[PDB]
Amino acid sequence: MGSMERASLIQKAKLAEQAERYEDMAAFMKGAVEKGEELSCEERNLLSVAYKNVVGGQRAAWRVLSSIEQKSGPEVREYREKVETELQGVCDTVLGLLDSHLIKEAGDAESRVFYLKMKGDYYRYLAEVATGDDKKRIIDSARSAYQEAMDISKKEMPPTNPIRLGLALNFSVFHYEIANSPEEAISLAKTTFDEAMADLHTLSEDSYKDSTLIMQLLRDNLTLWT
Amino acid sequence: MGSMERASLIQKAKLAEQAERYEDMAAFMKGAVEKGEELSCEERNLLSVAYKNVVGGQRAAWRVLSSIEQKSGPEVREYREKVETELQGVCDTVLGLLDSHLIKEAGDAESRVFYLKMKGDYYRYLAEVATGDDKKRIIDSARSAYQEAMDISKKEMPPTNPIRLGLALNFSVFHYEIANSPEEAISLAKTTFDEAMADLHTLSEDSYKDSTLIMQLLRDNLTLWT
Amino acid sequence: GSIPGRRS
Amino acid sequence: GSIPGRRS
Ligand SMILES: *Cc1ccc(S(=O)(=O)N2CCN(CC)CC2)cc1
Ligand SMILES: *Cc1ccc(S(=O)(=O)N2CCN(CC)CC2)cc1
Ligand SMILES: [Mg+2]
Ligand SMILES: [Mg+2]
């Protein structure tokens, strides 16, 4: 997208979202990132929404094909492998944008935490499909990214901040589903929920709605896990 | 897909449908068609389902972008144009498969009607986005395909046959939405419904369910149109 | 509306 | 489940 203006790429990403054209939306936002300027809060959200939709469809397809493969010529494995390779390619693309150079140029806590949460998520999606020599290393990469995000978030954000809350939610999912640490997942989700609940009194009506929506998700996991 | 076995392409198209990977499903079925053998009833349905899903997403996106464009830089028109070009490319691809050589090799009425209904549908989707020198010619192409399908279907199929019913449904939509002929649309839908209703007594339970599902769609249009 | 036609 | 994260 090198010949398109940054502002036009951002405008088109917004149009692509309204049209439910998430692959286009991701390509527009990748082009925007590659212009080399830092991203605003709204632009970070467009980038994240685009790729979460793309990889979400791939993950759902991969789970369907993997289930069929587990229940049973080479066609099912071949097709599962092609969807898997495509999913890994998208994750690698996102990780490459974060490494060149979104994270290193992100100095305030809001931006850096956002990108490190992304990094943990995309390594987590790689871990979901990993089986071999690098499954352990991929899991550690996800852990390290989430942990650094958590350390900054606890130092620099209030406990009701929605990015801090979503980070803790996803890290708890990492512990439960990837790292075989359900007790760590439960402890993290409970502590996060309780510390947020104690801070709600400081919030406006609108912020209260933002925070409680994510706190509910923590609760729904705790209900499924306990 | 020239190096993949026909049977493997058909198997993978079925897997792609279960995974909701419709672009893949369409590419697998295009590969199957290009092997040059005629298609069975089940295979014709896989081809049709794949492309209807692909073009359906494009049409829905095009309508979102066209609405935004009508309500209002060059970005919205540019993006609507790119989605439009992609939609036209898919329609041209389907029409090319029908012309080389599905229709000419389709000698029994079931196959020929199925493919001519497809041809009418894909010209209808082209007509939905056409504005210029060829809008009239594209509309006539759709009309001619549907009309030939109708002539064969009335001669060779009972009035409850589901393909005959779906053809009449879609042709009535063509009349209402494309050809500015709502009375022709209403007459066709009413006559189709009534002649099917008079034939239901000949059907098994399963066939009765197949036919009445499409008759309901004719009724829902008649209710919206009258 | 036309045949949905999107499920085999 | 994780953050849906699929709508801006
Ligand atoms: C990872 C993650 C956390 C929280 C959200 S949110 O609450 O839906 N929200 C955060 C802020 N932002 C601007 C209002 C939009 C999304 C999403 C993802
Ligand atoms: C164009 C069109 C007409 C009818 C259908 S159906 O009734 O859903 N059906 C026809 C036969 N076939 C095998 C049972 C599957 C689909 C679909 C499309
Ligand atoms: Mg510029
Ligand atoms: Mg062969």
Coordinates of C-alpha atoms in Angstrom, one line a residue, chain A:
Chain A
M1 CA 0.0 0.0 0.0
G2 CA 3.0 2.2 -0.4
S3 CA 1.4 4.6 -2.8
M4 CA -1.6 5.3 -0.7
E5 CA -1.7 8.2 1.8
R6 CA -1.7 7.3 5.5
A7 CA -4.9 9.1 6.1
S8 CA -6.6 7.3 3.2
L9 CA -5.5 4.0 4.5
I10 CA -7.0 4.8 7.9
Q11 CA -10.3 6.0 6.3
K12 CA -10.5 2.9 4.2
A13 CA -9.8 0.6 7.2
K14 CA -12.9 2.2 8.8
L15 CA -14.9 1.6 5.6
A16 CA -13.7 -2.0 5.5
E17 CA -14.8 -2.6 9.0
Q18 CA -18.3 -1.3 8.2
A19 CA -18.4 -3.5 5.1
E20 CA -17.2 -6.5 7.2
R21 CA -14.2 -6.8 4.9
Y22 CA -11.6 -7.7 7.5
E23 CA -8.8 -8.9 5.3
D24 CA -9.0 -5.6 3.5
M25 CA -9.1 -3.8 6.8
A26 CA -6.0 -5.6 8.0
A27 CA -4.1 -4.8 4.7
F28 CA -5.1 -1.1 5.0
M29 CA -3.9 -1.0 8.7
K30 CA -0.6 -2.9 7.8
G31 CA 0.0 -0.2 5.2
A32 CA -0.7 2.5 7.7
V33 CA 1.7 1.0 10.3
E34 CA 4.4 0.7 7.6
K35 CA 4.3 4.5 7.0
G36 CA 6.5 4.5 10.1
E37 CA 4.5 7.0 12.3
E38 CA 3.3 6.0 15.7
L39 CA -0.4 5.1 16.0
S40 CA -3.1 6.9 18.0
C41 CA -5.4 5.1 20.3
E42 CA -8.1 4.8 17.7
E43 CA -5.7 3.6 15.1
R44 CA -4.2 0.9 17.4
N45 CA -7.8 -0.3 17.9
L46 CA -8.4 -0.5 14.2
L47 CA -5.2 -2.5 13.7
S48 CA -6.2 -4.9 16.5
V49 CA -9.8 -5.3 15.4
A50 CA -8.7 -6.1 11.8
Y51 CA -6.3 -8.8 12.7
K52 CA -8.4 -10.3 15.5
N53 CA -11.2 -10.8 12.9
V54 CA -8.8 -12.3 10.4
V55 CA -7.1 -14.7 12.8
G56 CA -10.4 -15.4 14.5
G57 CA -11.8 -16.9 11.3
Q58 CA -8.7 -18.9 10.7
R59 CA -8.7 -20.2 14.3
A60 CA -12.3 -21.3 14.0
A61 CA -11.6 -23.0 10.7
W62 CA -8.5 -24.7 12.1
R63 CA -10.5 -26.0 15.1
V64 CA -13.2 -27.5 12.7
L65 CA -10.6 -29.2 10.6
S66 CA -8.5 -30.4 13.6
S67 CA -11.6 -32.0 15.1
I68 CA -12.4 -33.8 11.9
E69 CA -8.8 -34.9 11.6
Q70 CA -8.8 -36.2 15.2
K71 CA -12.0 -38.2 14.6
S72 CA -10.5 -39.9 11.6
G73 CA -6.7 -40.3 2.5
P74 CA -4.4 -37.3 3.2
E75 CA -6.9 -34.6 2.4
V76 CA -8.1 -33.6 5.9
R77 CA -4.5 -33.3 7.2
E78 CA -3.4 -31.5 4.0
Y79 CA -6.2 -29.0 4.3
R80 CA -5.8 -28.5 8.0
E81 CA -2.1 -27.9 7.3
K82 CA -2.8 -25.2 4.7
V83 CA -5.2 -23.4 7.0
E84 CA -2.5 -23.7 9.8
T85 CA 0.2 -22.3 7.6
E86 CA -2.0 -19.3 6.6
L87 CA -2.8 -18.7 10.3
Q88 CA 0.9 -18.8 11.2
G89 CA 1.6 -16.4 8.4
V90 CA -0.9 -13.9 9.7
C91 CA 0.5 -14.2 13.2
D92 CA 4.0 -13.7 11.9
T93 CA 2.9 -10.6 10.0
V94 CA 1.4 -9.1 13.1
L95 CA 4.4 -10.0 15.2
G96 CA 6.6 -8.4 12.6
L97 CA 4.7 -5.1 12.7
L98 CA 5.1 -5.1 16.5
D99 CA 8.8 -5.8 16.2
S100 CA 9.4 -3.4 13.4
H101 CA 8.8 -1.0 15.0
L102 CA 5.6 -0.4 17.0
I103 CA 6.9 -1.6 20.4
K104 CA 10.2 0.1 20.4
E105 CA 8.6 3.5 19.5
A106 CA 5.9 3.1 22.1
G107 CA 7.0 5.0 25.2
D108 CA 3.9 5.9 27.0
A109 CA 2.3 3.1 29.0
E110 CA -1.0 3.0 27.1
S111 CA 0.7 2.3 23.8
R112 CA 3.3 -0.1 25.0
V113 CA 0.9 -2.2 27.1
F114 CA -1.5 -2.4 24.1
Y115 CA 1.3 -3.7 21.8
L116 CA 2.7 -6.1 24.3
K117 CA -0.8 -7.5 24.9
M118 CA -1.0 -8.0 21.1
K119 CA 2.4 -9.7 21.1
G120 CA 1.2 -12.1 23.8
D121 CA -2.0 -12.8 22.0
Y122 CA -0.4 -13.6 18.6
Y123 CA 2.2 -15.9 20.2
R124 CA -0.7 -17.5 22.0
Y125 CA -2.4 -18.2 18.7
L126 CA 0.8 -19.7 17.4
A127 CA 1.0 -21.8 20.5
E128 CA -2.6 -23.1 19.9
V129 CA -1.4 -24.9 16.7
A130 CA 2.2 -25.7 17.7
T131 CA 3.2 -29.3 18.3
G132 CA 6.9 -29.7 17.9
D133 CA 10.4 -28.4 18.6
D134 CA 9.2 -24.8 19.3
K135 CA 5.9 -25.3 21.2
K136 CA 7.7 -24.6 24.5
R137 CA 9.6 -21.6 23.1
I138 CA 6.4 -20.1 21.6
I139 CA 4.6 -20.5 24.9
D140 CA 7.5 -18.7 26.7
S141 CA 7.4 -15.9 24.1
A142 CA 3.7 -15.4 24.9
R143 CA 4.3 -15.5 28.6
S144 CA 7.2 -13.0 28.5
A145 CA 5.2 -10.5 26.4
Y146 CA 2.1 -10.7 28.7
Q147 CA 4.3 -10.5 31.8
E148 CA 6.1 -7.4 30.6
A149 CA 2.7 -5.9 29.8
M150 CA 1.4 -6.8 33.2
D151 CA 4.4 -5.3 35.0
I152 CA 3.9 -1.9 33.2
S153 CA 0.1 -2.0 33.6
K154 CA 0.3 -2.5 37.3
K155 CA 2.8 0.3 37.7
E156 CA 1.2 2.8 35.4
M157 CA -2.6 2.2 35.0
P158 CA -5.5 2.2 37.4
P159 CA -7.0 -1.3 38.0
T160 CA -10.1 -0.4 36.1
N161 CA -8.3 0.6 32.9
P162 CA -9.9 -1.4 30.1
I163 CA -6.6 -2.3 28.4
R164 CA -5.2 -3.5 31.8
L165 CA -8.4 -5.5 32.3
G166 CA -8.3 -7.1 28.9
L167 CA -4.6 -7.9 29.3
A168 CA -5.3 -9.7 32.6
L169 CA -8.3 -11.5 31.0
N170 CA -6.3 -12.8 28.1
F171 CA -3.3 -13.7 30.2
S172 CA -5.6 -15.7 32.5
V173 CA -6.9 -17.5 29.4
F174 CA -3.2 -18.1 28.4
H175 CA -2.7 -19.7 31.9
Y176 CA -5.8 -21.8 31.7
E177 CA -5.7 -23.0 28.0
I178 CA -2.1 -22.9 27.0
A179 CA 0.2 -23.1 30.1
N180 CA -1.8 -25.8 31.9
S181 CA -2.0 -23.5 35.0
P182 CA -5.7 -23.3 35.9
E183 CA -5.0 -22.1 39.5
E184 CA -2.9 -19.3 38.2
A185 CA -5.6 -18.4 35.8
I186 CA -8.2 -18.4 38.5
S187 CA -6.1 -16.3 40.9
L188 CA -5.2 -13.7 38.3
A189 CA -8.9 -13.4 37.2
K190 CA -10.1 -13.1 40.8
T191 CA -7.5 -10.6 41.9
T192 CA -8.1 -8.5 38.8
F193 CA -11.8 -8.5 39.2
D194 CA -11.7 -7.6 42.9
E195 CA -9.1 -4.8 42.5
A196 CA -11.2 -3.3 39.7
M197 CA -14.4 -3.6 41.7
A198 CA -12.8 -1.6 44.6
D199 CA -11.8 1.2 42.1
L200 CA -15.2 1.6 40.3
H201 CA -16.2 4.4 42.7
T202 CA -13.7 6.7 41.0
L203 CA -15.2 6.4 37.5
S204 CA -17.7 8.4 35.5
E205 CA -20.8 6.6 34.2
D206 CA -19.1 6.0 30.8
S207 CA -15.9 4.7 32.2
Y208 CA -17.9 2.5 34.6
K209 CA -19.6 1.0 31.7
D210 CA -16.3 0.4 29.9
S211 CA -14.7 -1.3 32.9
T212 CA -17.6 -3.4 34.0
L213 CA -18.1 -4.9 30.6
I214 CA -14.6 -6.5 30.8
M215 CA -15.1 -7.3 34.5
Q216 CA -18.1 -9.4 33.4
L217 CA -15.9 -11.4 31.1
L218 CA -13.6 -12.2 34.0
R219 CA -16.6 -13.3 35.9
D220 CA -17.9 -15.5 33.1
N221 CA -14.5 -17.3 33.0
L222 CA -14.4 -17.7 36.8
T223 CA -17.9 -19.2 36.6
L224 CA -16.8 -21.7 34.0
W225 CA -13.6 -22.5 35.8
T226 CA -15.0 -22.9 39.3

